[PDB]
Coordinates of C-alpha atoms (C1' of nucleotides) in Angstrom, one line a residue:
Chain X
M1 CA 216.3 217.5 192.4
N2 CA 213.8 214.8 192.0
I3 CA 210.6 216.7 191.2
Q4 CA 208.7 213.5 190.5
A5 CA 209.2 212.2 194.1
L6 CA 208.3 215.7 195.3
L7 CA 204.9 215.9 193.5
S8 CA 204.6 212.2 194.3
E9 CA 204.2 213.0 198.0
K10 CA 202.2 216.2 197.8
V11 CA 199.6 214.3 195.7
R12 CA 199.8 211.3 198.0
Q13 CA 199.6 213.5 201.1
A14 CA 196.7 215.0 199.4
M15 CA 194.3 212.3 198.1
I16 CA 194.1 210.9 201.6
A17 CA 192.7 214.2 202.6
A18 CA 190.0 213.6 200.0
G19 CA 189.2 210.1 201.1
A20 CA 191.8 207.5 200.3
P21 CA 193.3 204.2 201.7
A22 CA 196.7 203.8 203.1
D23 CA 198.1 201.6 200.3
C24 CA 197.6 204.5 197.9
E25 CA 199.4 205.1 194.6
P26 CA 199.5 208.3 192.6
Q27 CA 201.0 207.7 189.2
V28 CA 203.2 210.8 188.8
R29 CA 204.8 210.6 185.4
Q30 CA 206.2 213.2 183.0
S31 CA 203.5 214.4 180.6
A32 CA 203.6 212.8 177.2
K33 CA 202.6 215.8 175.1
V34 CA 203.3 219.4 176.3
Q35 CA 199.5 219.9 176.3
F36 CA 199.4 218.1 179.7
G37 CA 202.0 220.3 181.4
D38 CA 205.3 219.1 182.9
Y39 CA 203.9 216.3 185.0
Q40 CA 200.8 214.0 185.1
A41 CA 199.0 212.3 188.0
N42 CA 197.5 209.2 186.6
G43 CA 196.6 207.5 189.9
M44 CA 193.0 208.8 190.0
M45 CA 191.1 206.3 187.7
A46 CA 192.4 203.2 189.4
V47 CA 191.7 204.6 192.9
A48 CA 188.4 206.0 191.6
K49 CA 187.0 202.5 191.5
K50 CA 188.0 200.8 194.8
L51 CA 185.7 203.4 196.4
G52 CA 183.4 203.3 193.3
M53 CA 183.0 207.0 192.7
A54 CA 183.7 209.1 189.6
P55 CA 187.3 209.8 188.4
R56 CA 186.7 213.4 187.1
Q57 CA 185.1 214.2 190.5
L58 CA 187.7 212.5 192.7
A59 CA 190.0 214.7 190.6
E60 CA 189.3 218.2 191.9
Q61 CA 188.3 216.8 195.3
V62 CA 192.1 216.4 195.7
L63 CA 193.0 219.8 194.3
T64 CA 191.1 221.3 197.3
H65 CA 193.9 220.0 199.6
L66 CA 196.6 219.9 196.9
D67 CA 198.7 223.0 197.5
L68 CA 201.4 223.2 194.8
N69 CA 201.8 226.9 195.4
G70 CA 205.4 228.0 195.0
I71 CA 205.7 224.9 192.7
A72 CA 203.1 224.9 190.0
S73 CA 201.5 227.8 188.3
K74 CA 198.6 225.9 186.6
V75 CA 196.9 222.7 187.8
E76 CA 194.0 221.4 185.7
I77 CA 191.9 218.3 185.0
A78 CA 191.8 216.7 181.6
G79 CA 190.5 213.5 180.0
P80 CA 189.0 210.8 182.3
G81 CA 190.5 212.6 185.3
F82 CA 194.2 213.2 184.8
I83 CA 195.8 215.8 187.1
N84 CA 198.0 217.9 184.9
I85 CA 200.7 220.0 186.6
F86 CA 202.2 223.0 184.8
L87 CA 205.4 223.9 186.7
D88 CA 206.0 227.6 187.7
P89 CA 209.0 229.3 186.1
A90 CA 210.2 230.8 189.4
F91 CA 210.3 227.2 190.8
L92 CA 212.5 225.9 188.0
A93 CA 214.7 229.0 187.9
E94 CA 215.6 228.3 191.6
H95 CA 216.7 224.7 191.3
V96 CA 218.4 225.3 188.0
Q97 CA 220.4 227.7 190.2
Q98 CA 220.9 225.2 193.0
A99 CA 222.3 222.7 190.6
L100 CA 225.0 225.1 189.5
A101 CA 226.2 225.7 193.1
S102 CA 226.8 222.0 193.5
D103 CA 229.5 219.7 192.0
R104 CA 226.9 217.0 191.7
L105 CA 224.4 219.3 190.0
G106 CA 221.9 219.0 192.8
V107 CA 221.7 215.2 192.6
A108 CA 221.1 213.8 196.0
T109 CA 223.0 210.9 197.6
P110 CA 220.8 207.9 198.3
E111 CA 221.1 205.4 201.2
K112 CA 224.7 204.2 200.8
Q113 CA 224.2 200.6 199.7
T114 CA 226.7 198.0 198.6
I115 CA 226.1 196.6 195.1
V116 CA 228.0 194.0 193.1
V117 CA 228.0 194.2 189.3
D118 CA 228.7 191.1 187.2
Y119 CA 229.9 192.1 183.7
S120 CA 232.3 191.4 180.9
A121 CA 233.2 187.8 181.9
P122 CA 235.8 186.7 179.2
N123 CA 237.5 183.3 178.8
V124 CA 241.0 182.1 179.5
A125 CA 243.6 181.3 176.8
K126 CA 241.4 182.8 174.2
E127 CA 241.5 186.2 172.5
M128 CA 238.5 188.2 173.7
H129 CA 235.7 187.8 171.2
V130 CA 233.2 190.5 170.2
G131 CA 230.3 188.6 171.8
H132 CA 231.4 190.0 175.2
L133 CA 231.5 193.6 174.2
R134 CA 227.9 194.2 175.1
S135 CA 228.2 192.9 178.7
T136 CA 231.4 194.9 179.3
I137 CA 230.1 198.2 178.2
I138 CA 226.6 198.3 179.8
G139 CA 228.0 196.8 183.0
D140 CA 230.6 199.5 183.3
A141 CA 227.9 202.1 182.6
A142 CA 225.9 200.7 185.5
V143 CA 229.0 200.7 187.8
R144 CA 229.8 204.4 186.9
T145 CA 226.2 205.4 187.4
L146 CA 226.0 203.6 190.8
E147 CA 229.4 205.0 191.9
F148 CA 228.4 208.6 191.2
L149 CA 225.3 208.1 193.3
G150 CA 227.6 207.2 196.2
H151 CA 227.1 203.4 196.6
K152 CA 230.0 201.0 197.2
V153 CA 230.3 199.1 193.9
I154 CA 232.2 195.8 193.7
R155 CA 233.1 195.1 190.1
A156 CA 232.8 191.4 189.5
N157 CA 234.6 189.7 186.6
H158 CA 233.3 186.1 186.4
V159 CA 236.2 184.8 184.2
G160 CA 236.0 181.3 182.8
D161 CA 239.3 180.3 184.2
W162 CA 238.4 176.7 184.8
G163 CA 237.1 173.6 183.0
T164 CA 238.3 170.5 181.2
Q165 CA 240.1 172.3 178.4
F166 CA 243.0 173.2 180.7
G167 CA 244.4 169.7 180.2
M168 CA 244.4 170.4 176.5
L169 CA 245.7 173.9 177.3
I170 CA 248.5 173.3 179.9
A171 CA 249.9 170.4 177.9
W172 CA 250.2 172.6 174.9
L173 CA 251.8 175.3 177.0
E174 CA 254.2 172.8 178.4
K175 CA 255.0 171.8 174.8
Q176 CA 254.9 175.3 173.4
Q177 CA 257.5 176.3 176.0
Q178 CA 259.9 173.9 174.3
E179 CA 260.3 176.2 171.3
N180 CA 260.9 179.6 172.6
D181 CA 251.6 185.4 172.1
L182 CA 248.2 183.8 172.4
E183 CA 246.5 183.8 169.0
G184 CA 246.2 180.2 167.8
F185 CA 246.3 178.7 171.2
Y186 CA 242.8 177.2 172.0
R187 CA 242.4 176.7 168.2
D188 CA 245.6 174.6 167.7
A189 CA 245.4 172.6 170.9
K190 CA 241.9 171.6 169.8
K191 CA 243.2 170.1 166.6
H192 CA 245.2 167.7 168.8
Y193 CA 242.5 166.5 171.2
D194 CA 240.3 165.0 168.4
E195 CA 241.9 164.3 165.0
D196 CA 244.6 163.3 165.1
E197 CA 246.7 162.8 168.2
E198 CA 248.2 160.0 170.5
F199 CA 249.2 161.5 173.8
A200 CA 245.9 163.2 174.7
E201 CA 245.8 160.8 177.6
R202 CA 248.7 163.0 178.7
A203 CA 246.2 165.9 178.6
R204 CA 243.2 164.0 180.1
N205 CA 245.5 163.1 183.0
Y206 CA 247.0 166.6 183.3
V207 CA 243.6 168.0 184.5
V208 CA 243.0 165.5 187.3
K209 CA 246.1 166.9 189.0
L210 CA 244.9 170.4 188.8
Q211 CA 241.9 169.7 191.1
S212 CA 244.4 168.1 193.5
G213 CA 246.8 171.0 193.1
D214 CA 250.6 171.3 193.2
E215 CA 252.4 174.6 192.3
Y216 CA 253.7 173.1 189.0
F217 CA 250.3 172.6 187.5
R218 CA 249.1 175.6 189.5
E219 CA 251.7 177.9 187.9
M220 CA 250.8 176.5 184.4
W221 CA 247.3 177.6 185.3
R222 CA 247.9 181.1 186.7
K223 CA 250.6 181.7 184.0
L224 CA 248.0 180.9 181.4
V225 CA 245.4 182.9 183.1
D226 CA 247.4 186.1 183.9
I227 CA 248.5 186.4 180.2
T228 CA 244.9 186.3 179.0
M229 CA 243.9 188.9 181.6
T230 CA 246.8 191.1 180.6
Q231 CA 245.8 191.0 177.0
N232 CA 242.3 191.9 178.1
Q233 CA 243.3 194.7 180.5
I234 CA 244.8 196.3 177.4
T235 CA 241.4 195.9 175.6
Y236 CA 239.7 197.4 178.6
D237 CA 242.1 200.3 178.8
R238 CA 241.4 200.9 175.1
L239 CA 237.7 200.6 175.7
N240 CA 237.9 203.0 178.7
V241 CA 236.3 200.3 180.9
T242 CA 236.9 200.7 184.6
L243 CA 237.6 197.0 185.1
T244 CA 240.9 195.9 186.8
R245 CA 242.8 192.7 187.5
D246 CA 241.8 192.8 191.2
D247 CA 238.2 192.7 190.1
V248 CA 238.5 189.1 188.8
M249 CA 236.4 186.5 190.6
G250 CA 236.0 183.7 188.1
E251 CA 235.1 180.0 188.2
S252 CA 237.8 179.3 190.8
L253 CA 236.6 181.1 194.0
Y254 CA 233.3 179.4 193.3
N255 CA 234.7 175.9 193.1
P256 CA 235.9 174.4 196.5
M257 CA 232.4 175.5 197.6
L258 CA 230.7 172.8 195.4
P259 CA 230.9 170.0 198.0
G260 CA 229.4 171.7 201.1
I261 CA 226.8 173.4 199.0
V262 CA 225.0 170.3 197.7
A263 CA 225.8 168.4 200.9
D264 CA 224.1 171.2 202.9
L265 CA 221.5 171.2 200.2
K266 CA 220.9 167.5 201.1
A267 CA 221.3 168.1 204.8
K268 CA 218.2 170.3 204.6
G269 CA 216.0 168.0 202.6
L270 CA 215.9 169.5 199.1
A271 CA 217.8 167.0 196.9
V272 CA 217.0 163.6 195.4
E273 CA 219.3 161.3 193.5
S274 CA 216.9 161.1 190.6
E275 CA 218.1 159.6 187.2
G276 CA 221.6 159.3 188.6
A277 CA 222.1 162.9 189.5
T278 CA 221.5 165.2 192.5
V279 CA 218.5 167.3 191.8
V280 CA 216.3 170.0 193.5
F281 CA 212.6 170.3 192.8
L282 CA 210.8 173.6 192.1
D283 CA 207.2 174.5 191.2
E284 CA 206.3 177.4 189.0
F285 CA 206.0 176.6 185.3
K286 CA 204.5 173.8 183.2
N287 CA 202.0 171.0 183.0
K288 CA 204.1 168.6 185.0
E289 CA 207.6 169.1 186.6
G290 CA 210.9 170.4 185.4
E291 CA 214.3 169.8 187.1
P292 CA 217.8 171.3 187.4
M293 CA 220.9 169.4 188.6
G294 CA 224.0 169.7 190.8
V295 CA 226.1 166.6 190.1
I296 CA 225.9 163.5 188.0
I297 CA 229.3 161.9 188.6
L298 CA 227.6 172.4 186.5
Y299 CA 226.7 175.9 185.3
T300 CA 223.9 176.0 187.8
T301 CA 225.6 174.9 191.0
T302 CA 228.3 177.5 190.6
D303 CA 225.9 180.4 190.5
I304 CA 224.3 179.3 193.8
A305 CA 227.7 179.5 195.5
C306 CA 228.3 182.7 193.6
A307 CA 225.0 184.4 194.6
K308 CA 225.8 183.1 198.1
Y309 CA 229.4 184.4 198.3
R310 CA 228.3 187.8 197.2
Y311 CA 226.0 188.0 200.2
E312 CA 227.9 186.1 203.0
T313 CA 231.4 187.5 202.4
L314 CA 231.0 190.6 200.3
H315 CA 227.9 191.8 202.1
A316 CA 225.9 192.5 198.9
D317 CA 222.7 194.5 199.5
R318 CA 222.1 194.1 195.8
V319 CA 223.7 192.2 192.9
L320 CA 223.4 192.9 189.2
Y321 CA 224.1 190.3 186.5
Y322 CA 224.9 191.4 182.9
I323 CA 224.9 188.1 181.1
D324 CA 223.7 186.6 177.8
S325 CA 220.0 185.8 177.2
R326 CA 220.8 182.1 176.8
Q327 CA 221.4 181.8 180.5
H328 CA 218.2 183.2 182.0
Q329 CA 217.0 179.7 182.8
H330 CA 220.2 178.5 184.4
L331 CA 220.2 181.5 186.6
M332 CA 216.5 181.8 187.6
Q333 CA 216.4 178.1 188.3
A334 CA 219.6 178.1 190.3
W335 CA 218.4 181.4 192.0
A336 CA 215.0 180.0 192.9
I337 CA 217.1 177.3 194.7
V338 CA 218.7 180.1 196.8
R339 CA 215.2 181.6 197.5
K340 CA 214.0 178.3 199.0
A341 CA 217.2 177.5 200.9
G342 CA 217.9 180.8 202.6
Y343 CA 221.5 181.5 201.6
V344 CA 220.8 185.0 200.4
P345 CA 217.7 186.7 201.9
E346 CA 214.8 188.8 200.4
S347 CA 216.1 192.3 200.9
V348 CA 218.9 191.4 198.5
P349 CA 217.7 191.4 194.9
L350 CA 219.3 189.1 192.2
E351 CA 218.7 191.1 189.1
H352 CA 219.4 189.7 185.6
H353 CA 219.9 192.1 182.7
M354 CA 220.0 190.4 179.4
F355 CA 220.9 190.8 175.7
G356 CA 221.0 188.8 172.5
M357 CA 223.7 188.0 169.9
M358 CA 225.6 190.4 167.7
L359 CA 224.2 190.5 164.2
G360 CA 225.2 192.5 161.1
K361 CA 223.0 194.4 158.6
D362 CA 221.5 191.1 157.5
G363 CA 220.2 189.2 160.5
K364 CA 223.1 186.8 160.4
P365 CA 225.6 186.4 163.3
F366 CA 228.3 189.1 163.4
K367 CA 231.2 187.5 161.7
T368 CA 234.1 188.4 159.4
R369 CA 234.0 188.1 155.6
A370 CA 236.2 185.0 155.9
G371 CA 233.3 183.5 157.9
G372 CA 234.4 183.3 161.6
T373 CA 234.7 184.9 165.0
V374 CA 235.5 188.6 165.1
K375 CA 238.2 189.5 167.6
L376 CA 237.4 192.6 169.8
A377 CA 240.7 194.2 169.1
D378 CA 240.2 193.9 165.3
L379 CA 236.8 195.6 165.8
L380 CA 238.3 198.5 167.8
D381 CA 241.0 198.9 165.1
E382 CA 238.4 199.4 162.4
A383 CA 236.4 201.7 164.7
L384 CA 239.4 204.0 165.0
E385 CA 240.1 203.8 161.3
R386 CA 236.5 204.5 160.2
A387 CA 236.5 207.4 162.8
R388 CA 239.7 208.8 161.3
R389 CA 238.1 208.8 157.8
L390 CA 235.1 210.5 159.3
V391 CA 236.9 213.3 161.1
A392 CA 239.2 213.8 158.1
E393 CA 236.6 214.7 155.4
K394 CA 235.2 217.4 157.7
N395 CA 238.2 218.8 159.4
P396 CA 241.1 218.1 157.1
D397 CA 244.6 219.7 157.2
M398 CA 244.6 219.7 160.9
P399 CA 247.3 218.6 163.5
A400 CA 247.6 214.9 163.5
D401 CA 248.6 215.2 167.2
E402 CA 245.0 216.0 167.9
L403 CA 243.3 213.8 165.4
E404 CA 244.0 210.4 167.0
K405 CA 242.8 212.0 170.3
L406 CA 239.6 213.0 168.6
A407 CA 239.3 209.8 166.6
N408 CA 239.6 207.9 169.8
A409 CA 236.7 209.7 171.3
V410 CA 234.5 209.4 168.2
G411 CA 235.4 205.9 167.3
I412 CA 235.6 204.2 170.7
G413 CA 232.7 206.3 171.9
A414 CA 230.5 205.1 169.0
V415 CA 231.3 201.5 169.8
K416 CA 230.1 201.9 173.3
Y417 CA 227.3 204.4 172.7
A418 CA 225.5 201.8 170.5
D419 CA 224.6 199.3 173.2
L420 CA 223.9 202.3 175.3
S421 CA 220.9 203.0 173.1
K422 CA 219.4 199.6 172.8
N423 CA 217.7 197.7 175.7
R424 CA 216.5 194.6 173.8
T425 CA 217.4 191.1 174.6
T426 CA 216.6 189.6 171.2
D427 CA 219.8 190.1 169.3
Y428 CA 221.0 193.3 167.8
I429 CA 222.3 194.9 164.6
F430 CA 225.9 196.2 164.4
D431 CA 226.1 198.7 161.6
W432 CA 228.9 201.2 161.2
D433 CA 226.7 203.6 159.2
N434 CA 224.3 204.0 162.2
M435 CA 226.9 204.4 165.0
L436 CA 229.4 206.6 163.2
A437 CA 227.2 209.5 162.1
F438 CA 226.6 213.1 163.0
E439 CA 222.9 212.4 162.7
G440 CA 220.6 210.7 165.2
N441 CA 221.2 209.2 168.6
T442 CA 224.9 208.7 168.1
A443 CA 227.9 209.5 170.3
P444 CA 229.4 211.8 167.7
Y445 CA 226.3 213.9 167.7
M446 CA 226.3 214.2 171.5
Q447 CA 230.0 214.9 171.4
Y448 CA 229.5 217.5 168.8
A449 CA 226.4 218.9 170.6
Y450 CA 228.5 219.2 173.7
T451 CA 231.2 221.2 171.9
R452 CA 228.4 223.3 170.4
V453 CA 226.9 224.2 173.8
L454 CA 230.3 224.9 175.3
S455 CA 231.2 227.4 172.7
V456 CA 228.4 229.7 173.6
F457 CA 229.7 229.8 177.2
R458 CA 233.1 230.8 175.9
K459 CA 232.8 233.7 173.4
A460 CA 231.3 235.9 176.1
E461 CA 233.3 237.9 178.6
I462 CA 231.4 237.4 181.8
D463 CA 233.9 235.5 184.0
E464 CA 233.0 232.5 186.2
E465 CA 232.9 234.0 189.7
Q466 CA 230.4 236.9 189.2
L467 CA 228.1 235.3 186.6
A468 CA 226.6 233.1 189.4
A469 CA 225.7 236.3 191.2
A470 CA 223.3 237.4 188.5
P471 CA 220.3 235.1 188.8
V472 CA 218.0 233.2 186.4
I473 CA 214.7 234.7 185.3
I474 CA 212.7 232.4 183.1
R475 CA 210.2 234.4 181.0
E476 CA 209.8 232.3 177.9
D477 CA 208.4 228.8 177.2
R478 CA 211.5 227.3 175.6
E479 CA 213.7 228.2 178.6
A480 CA 211.1 226.6 180.8
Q481 CA 211.1 223.4 178.7
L482 CA 214.9 223.3 178.9
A483 CA 215.2 224.2 182.6
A484 CA 212.7 221.5 183.4
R485 CA 214.5 218.7 181.6
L486 CA 217.8 219.9 183.1
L487 CA 216.4 219.3 186.5
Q488 CA 215.1 215.9 185.6
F489 CA 218.7 214.6 185.7
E490 CA 218.2 213.0 189.0
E491 CA 215.1 211.2 187.9
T492 CA 216.9 209.6 184.9
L493 CA 219.8 208.7 187.1
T494 CA 217.5 207.0 189.6
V495 CA 215.8 205.1 186.8
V496 CA 219.2 203.8 185.5
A497 CA 220.3 202.7 188.9
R498 CA 217.0 201.1 189.6
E499 CA 216.3 199.3 186.3
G500 CA 220.0 198.8 185.4
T501 CA 219.3 200.4 182.0
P502 CA 221.7 203.1 180.7
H503 CA 219.6 203.6 177.5
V504 CA 217.4 205.9 179.5
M505 CA 220.3 208.2 180.3
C506 CA 221.3 208.4 176.6
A507 CA 217.7 208.9 175.5
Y508 CA 217.5 211.8 178.0
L509 CA 220.8 213.3 176.8
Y510 CA 219.7 213.1 173.2
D511 CA 216.4 214.6 174.3
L512 CA 218.3 217.2 176.3
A513 CA 220.3 218.2 173.3
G514 CA 217.4 218.8 171.0
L515 CA 215.9 221.3 173.5
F516 CA 219.1 223.4 173.5
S517 CA 219.3 223.2 169.7
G518 CA 215.8 224.7 169.6
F519 CA 216.4 227.0 172.6
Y520 CA 219.4 228.4 170.6
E521 CA 217.8 229.1 167.2
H522 CA 215.1 231.1 169.0
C523 CA 216.4 232.5 172.3
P524 CA 219.6 234.6 171.7
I525 CA 221.9 233.9 174.6
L526 CA 224.3 235.7 172.3
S527 CA 223.0 239.2 172.7
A528 CA 219.6 240.4 173.9
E529 CA 217.8 243.5 175.1
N530 CA 219.4 243.5 178.6
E531 CA 222.1 241.9 180.8
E532 CA 219.4 240.4 183.0
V533 CA 218.6 237.7 180.5
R534 CA 222.0 237.5 178.8
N535 CA 223.6 236.1 181.9
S536 CA 220.5 234.0 182.7
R537 CA 220.4 232.1 179.5
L538 CA 224.2 231.7 179.7
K539 CA 223.7 229.9 183.1
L540 CA 220.8 228.0 181.6
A541 CA 223.2 226.9 178.8
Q542 CA 226.1 226.5 181.3
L543 CA 224.1 223.9 183.2
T544 CA 223.4 221.6 180.3
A545 CA 227.1 221.7 179.4
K546 CA 227.8 220.5 182.9
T547 CA 224.8 218.1 182.7
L548 CA 225.8 216.7 179.3
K549 CA 229.3 216.2 180.5
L550 CA 228.3 214.4 183.7
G551 CA 225.7 212.4 181.8
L552 CA 228.1 211.2 179.2
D553 CA 230.6 210.5 182.0
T554 CA 228.3 208.0 183.6
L555 CA 228.2 206.1 180.3
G556 CA 231.9 206.2 179.8
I557 CA 232.0 208.4 176.7
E558 CA 234.9 210.7 176.0
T559 CA 234.1 214.4 175.5
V560 CA 236.4 216.5 173.3
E561 CA 236.3 220.2 174.1
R562 CA 236.5 221.2 170.5
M563 CA 235.6 219.9 167.0
Chain Q
rG1 C1' 208.3 166.5 171.9
rC2 C1' 208.6 170.2 177.1
rG3 C1' 211.0 175.0 178.4
rC4 C1' 213.5 180.4 177.9
rU5 C1' 213.6 185.5 175.3
rC6 C1' 210.8 187.8 171.7
rG7 C1' 207.7 189.7 167.1
rU8 C1' 206.4 197.7 166.9
rA9 C1' 206.8 202.6 160.3
rG10 C1' 210.7 200.0 154.4
rC11 C1' 215.6 200.0 158.0
rU12 C1' 218.0 200.7 163.1
rC13 C1' 215.7 201.8 168.0
rA14 C1' 211.9 204.1 171.6
rA15 C1' 207.4 204.4 174.4
rU16 C1' 208.8 206.9 182.2
rU17 C1' 206.5 199.2 183.2
rG18 C1' 198.5 199.6 182.6
rG19 C1' 197.7 205.9 180.8
rA20 C1' 195.5 210.7 176.9
rU21 C1' 196.3 211.3 169.4
rA22 C1' 202.4 204.7 169.8
rG23 C1' 207.5 208.5 169.2
rA24 C1' 212.9 209.8 167.2
rG25 C1' 217.1 209.0 163.3
rC26 C1' 218.4 207.2 158.3
rA27 C1' 215.7 206.1 153.6
rU28 C1' 211.4 208.1 150.1
rC29 C1' 208.4 212.3 147.1
rA30 C1' 211.7 223.3 157.1
rG31 C1' 207.1 221.1 157.4
rA32 C1' 204.7 216.0 154.7
rA33 C1' 203.9 211.0 154.4
rG34 C1' 204.7 206.4 156.4
rG35 C1' 200.9 201.8 161.9
rU36 C1' 194.7 196.7 162.7
rU37 C1' 202.1 197.2 167.6
rA38 C1' 202.7 189.3 163.5
rG39 C1' 197.1 187.6 164.1
rG40 C1' 192.3 186.1 166.6
rG41 C1' 189.9 186.1 171.4
rG42 C1' 189.6 187.6 176.4
rU43 C1' 190.4 190.5 181.2
rU44 C1' 188.7 196.7 182.6
rC45 C1' 187.5 203.1 182.7
rG46 C1' 192.1 202.3 179.4
rA47 C1' 196.5 197.3 176.4
rA48 C1' 202.2 197.5 172.1
rU49 C1' 202.4 196.1 177.6
rC50 C1' 198.7 191.2 181.5
rC51 C1' 195.7 186.1 180.2
rU52 C1' 194.7 182.1 176.5
rC53 C1' 195.4 180.3 171.5
rU54 C1' 197.6 180.3 166.1
rC55 C1' 201.7 181.5 163.1
rG56 C1' 206.9 182.9 163.1
rA57 C1' 212.2 184.1 164.6
rG58 C1' 216.6 183.1 168.1
rC59 C1' 218.7 179.9 172.0
rG60 C1' 218.8 176.7 176.0
rC61 C1' 217.6 171.5 178.9
rG62 C1' 215.3 166.4 176.4
rC63 C1' 214.6 160.2 174.7

RNA sequence: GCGCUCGUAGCUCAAUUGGAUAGAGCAUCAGAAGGUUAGGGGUUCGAAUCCUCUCGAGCGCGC
């Protein structure tokens, strides 16, 4: 149920009937304060200028043809001409009911698109670092959200499985095999190819045979790759990320394309051998002219083939990119090249969602106390430990068999539900005291809140198959608030899918919880004057439980049934 | 030197993308307090949001 889009039309299909142009835009948002009802129409003022009249007069000129009967119970004008809509109880207590009768809670299925999500993107022959945790989590949240809506999501893991370093890598592997897993690999082999070593010409030659390709050096490649991706699939499985091995499309598939991509870029008149390198000129920035590359004898030419392959072979209607902030240039530049070359059209967006670096409670890069890179596994280990200590001092002397299970949900959930709360792209603070707490917008609070709600719909007799025969009658203004927000689940979902931002979902869920936690300490679902309301508020509570569950599911957050 | 992303309560984060009196959680003496949205100017009915400067933070291409 997308009430916004509903009122969006009935106001648009109005307005016109009060003198308005075709390209018309009502601005139907959710009211800030509760003074302004459940929804606002802001589109007046802006329109009330292109015709040069008066906003507070164009206002009720629309209400004359605006018939929100059976929908709203109170429509009034306020301020410089806002149209405030106070939803009618009987309208809410009809879609609150419709959501219950559906396994998708009334959420409608959009036009079945085909989207490609680019997330995680770890490196080869290196233990996965914590600087990739953000990309992996948010990307998976996007995928889950899109998948629930019904689209066809192609998970894309752009693994750095190619580069110069493989000469330094494979040679070490070839040598490290003469003694007998990856922990001091990339680190030790680096100590050779600089100071000090003699047969690095062995390594610098070992790479030039990989581009040519013969199974021997091809095995030493895949062998080195498959081990890294096996270590990482473990990390994913621990992290509850939906990624898989057959979701890997790294810097290998987008490599034999490099010739006939700049050649075709030259065979279309767009490249000049400036400075000594193939370059392609664009025009939308500074006081002279900037310039990307392609060759010289790069991290911009690969993405072009990438963004092309998504469209031409994978039939991507849309393609999301969850990548570090320090890559916005290299993408936008290399994407503007695809916009003025016609590889991928216009109906196919190339979205880029960004984020900064991991920092601690001190503005410095997130590192260990030794002063170095933090392994993601080592982070998850402490997450589970700190969670155990958390659950212990509140629920001690309890079956260990169901503590690790609960500590898993709390700890691993907190690690995820911490990027799913921030939307910035200018670095971020990692603080255990913020994420692992029963207070605030934290996963444990949501997880506890969900158990709380669920308990109410448990201690009562009223079985499952006759409860939904007694209807919902909303008579009080806290039930109306709750029921409204409950129905705004589709809106939030559509915003997440559109903007690629899961923080909205979490903000909603946090906001959704607070309503219940206020609807509870005032409106006794427990026991009231009659059965008519007892069952009604149960269903009203029953919905949020299903809603909180489904919401947390789209984020990839475990939900324990009991705390 | 050019260029990217930014600057919001003491801290960690919001603000439905230009809407009404900028909101939550810790912290500080259930409600309370906490703000010239780094700062000036400008654009219009209306700005944390957009345009131009200054300062400042982080990172990419530069000789």
